[PDB]
């Protein structure tokens, strides 16, 4: 699809048998989601944003569905105020910025 | 053109007749630039992201050229880690997300 940006680009994702709303975010290197449980090992990480840094849990090779794209990648879990889909998954769905 | 997301979608912009690199950021409602001078009246605003808020100066009706497209709009200035082009201007150059 072509998504115009008059609104926040929020879409449905499916992860860990849960449906969630998330933000398609070209300004994020990584995908970060609000507090949740994922299976398997993780490693602590710090990520930075506009107003400073937060600590997150890094989970690798997590399957996630984004607008009917079934993909697999790294998912960060921590106190982001909005679920964020970053470049690591946007590339996986063939997402480009066009003008 | 069509910009891929393997790397940060950074572009050259010209503002106050100064050339800078800025990030095309679909996860930002607004455009915020690192500390600089802009002419005219401004008012203070808080903006927040991952990890909290920063205080910025809101300047309106500011000309800015983004990858060769000349637009005029609201530009925020403050302690952002990077120059950010937000949806308020992305929409003005006809930028869409496409997959």
């Amino acid at each position: 699809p072509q998504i115009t940006l008059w609104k926040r680009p929020l879409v449905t994702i499916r992860i860990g048998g849960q449906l969630k709303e998330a933000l398609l975010n070209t300004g994020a290197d990584d995908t970060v989601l609000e507090e949740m449980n994922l299976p398997g090992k993780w490693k602590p990480k710090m990520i930075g944003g506009v107003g400073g840094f937060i600590k997150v849990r890094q989970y690798d090779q997590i399957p996630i569905e984004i607008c009917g794209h079934k993909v697999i990648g790294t998912v960060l879990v921590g106190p982001t105020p909005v679920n964020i889909i970053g470049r690591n998954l946007l590339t996986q769905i063939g997402c480009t910025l066009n003008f | 053109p069509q910009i891929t997301l393997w790397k940060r979608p950074l572009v050259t912009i010209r503002i106050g007749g100064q050339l800078k690199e800025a990030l095309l950021n679909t996860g930002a409602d607004d455009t915020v630039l690192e500390e600089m001078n802009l002419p005219g009246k401004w008012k203070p605003k808080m903006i927040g992201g991952v990890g909290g808020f920063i205080k910025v100066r809101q300047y309106d009706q500011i000309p800015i050229e983004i990858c060769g497209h000349k637009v005029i709009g609201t530009v925020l200035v403050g302690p952002t880690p990077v120059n950010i082009i937000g949806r308020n201007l992305l929409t003005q150059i006809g930028c869409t997300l496409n997959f």
Partner: peptide, 10 residues
């Protein structure tokens, strides 16, 4: 509300 979601892997 928060509205600028830049995110950096440092």
């Amino acid at each position: 509300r928060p509205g600028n979601f830049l995110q950096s892997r440092p």
